[PDB]
Write a protein that binds this DNA or RNA. Sequence first.
DNA 1: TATCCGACATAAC
DNA 2: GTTATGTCGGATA
Length: 749
Amino acid sequence: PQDPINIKAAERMGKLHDTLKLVGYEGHALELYLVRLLFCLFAEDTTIFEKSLFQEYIETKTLEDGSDLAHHINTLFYVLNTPEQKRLKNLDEHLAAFPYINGKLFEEPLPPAQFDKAMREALLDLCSLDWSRISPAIFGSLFQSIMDAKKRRNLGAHYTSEANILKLIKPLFLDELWVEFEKVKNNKNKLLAFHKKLRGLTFFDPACGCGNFLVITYRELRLLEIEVLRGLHRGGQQVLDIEHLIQINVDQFFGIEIEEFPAQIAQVALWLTDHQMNMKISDEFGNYFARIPLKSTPHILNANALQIDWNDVLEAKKCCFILGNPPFVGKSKQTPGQKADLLSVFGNLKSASDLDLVAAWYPKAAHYIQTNANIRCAFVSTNSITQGEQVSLLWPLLLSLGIKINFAHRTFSWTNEASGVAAVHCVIIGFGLKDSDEKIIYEYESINGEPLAIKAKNINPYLRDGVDVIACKRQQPISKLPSMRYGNKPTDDGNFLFTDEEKNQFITNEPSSEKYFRRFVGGDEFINNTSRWCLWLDGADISEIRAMPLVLARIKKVQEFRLKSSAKPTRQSASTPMKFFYISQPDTDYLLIPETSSENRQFIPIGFVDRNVISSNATYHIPSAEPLIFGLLSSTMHNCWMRNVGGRLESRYRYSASLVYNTFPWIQPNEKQSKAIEEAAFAILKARSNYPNESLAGLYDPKTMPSELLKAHQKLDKAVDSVYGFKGPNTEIARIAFLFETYQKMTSL
DNA sequence: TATCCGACATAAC
DNA sequence: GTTATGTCGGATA
Ligand SMILES: Nc1ncnc2c1ncn2[C@@H]1O[C@H](C[C@@H](N)CC[C@H](N)C(=O)O)[C@@H](O)[C@H]1O
Ligand SMILES: [Ca+2]
């Protein structure tokens, strides 16, 4: 038998596409030419064509140099559209063996292409594999393999695993369809009504890619529909009559896709799955049943789902489910076209440009279903739209429109079976206009593991079981606390930064420069006790900088890099090329908080730093911080706050003054409570000192953390918890919920 | 001025 | 290539 296809076959087929593209067979013809070939490869390996008829024809009626191949394929494409009654009586016997196929797939005449030896062999190469068991992974890898890395990233062109679609469609509709099936399966009447209900269901993916959500869904429906016909069978031991019993078909699936090639795959993907299932039902009940020629057609539109009215694809009143995996694009990574798309959907809302592109599909869906509250929706999305600065900008608008979250998958790692897996963490948000009396939140122990369904009273805009209050960005703290500041941002392409060895090479080469070096600490250098230096030129005497060539060359390298920038303020900054782009350095010693750091720690390692070391923008800091405040930011309570209202990078903690610290509710303490927290603070500090040559990473890894440090932190929480009057169960659940009662009491005043 | 963020970036097994 | 865990500067206000 022939080797079944794997991912390497789709990738090879993709190279055929780009090989054809490079000789000028471009555009619409190219996309449909290839998807036609795909159908032929599947067809000869099933019973649509006689076994291997396509391959044999190419091998016997086509020249080895590939010179004539495209002529014969062009006539083949015409035959497959010509019913047998309209074929020339003298048509080549070998060509006459091919069935009439028709359908939107073969109706358009196409310019003939041109092949050579290697393109012919590549296509015969594809023929020799078995296309019989073609799956989402194949359709997705093919879709992905024709795209530049920059394109793949920017359209979010990442196909969705079988597994990730199943976590989305099982709660959305599928599981309930199996419960309902099992309850009526023994009543011929109710089973008949159940079939008609299955036939009338429509599925709508407004960013459908290569169609996997539609393909998996249609396959599950076909599988269900087999057991339904098994049920209904009133002929006992006679062969079940499929053609007049079957109903479900591709005309129930609808999709929008901006690139034509995935929009063409999605269509053929649905027909191949159709035939795959027709063969499977033909096996169960032993009688041959195929839907050839292609009389039913999906409704995939090639368009821009953010610029059109979805009702042109599918009238809302005739629609049932909206599902899919829309593209993820950060606020500062999106092209002028997609920012404008984003802003069209959100109108004149404040800071709406700060949303991920994926957020755009939510108000669209929310406006679309306003005319039919029976629709239920679910979207994969980057977990970022449930964290930090975006929660305030997306969920006020969604809640105001009636949108209610009915189930949700919390953060998990992305993956699929194709090349170049993207590195992003995800959520799944099921929503609609009807509250559900049984909301489930699926939780993950291993970010890579399988989920566990947990009952939920309510589902937060953060996807938590709690109240619907959102923590908003603030420029100053709601509590009585000293202001916090952002570290200095260099924008220097590294020209002002050095390793110790570099600082030594540079000093010997330019000894007059020692006066201008100062210690440089980012988050990574501080957490890990690594040494780094910067040239600190804020307020340098120009008579001293003229003397020094090596420095002058750095200042010129900063300026040249800064002019090449694309952000006008950066270009502007090129004309002060010896000063950091943003400067915040204090005059007093300060408390440093790293910006981005491992979620595996129970506390964010913070600490005190000398006023002469320059802190990078990968950190925050409080100038002249009394020990009490170091206790407060060390506390479980603060870190629980940071964990819940802060943002994340994939999943690492990301601190930010305006989201965490400034919204942090904190009651001012007595003199005894204040002295207590100070005493624990010094106990933590001392506990750290007693371990030379341990970096803060080594000390705050909770595996390797010394018990003497854990105790001082336990001493500290007790003092801070006392200031709150917090007596509750000492869990992240009870602490989060209690801080939000405090936050709301303050935000109500 | 003043950032939050990254279908990530990249040094380390 | 996996695994572990934080840079750097854009875009916007
Ligand atoms: N404005 C847009 N309108 C319509 N489609 C878009 C738009 N932006 C990106 N896309 C497409 O969104 C898709 C995102 C993918 N994650 C979908 C893949 C698809 N779920 C699959 O399983 O294969 C890409 O295929 C894009 O071409
Ligand atoms: Ca074959």
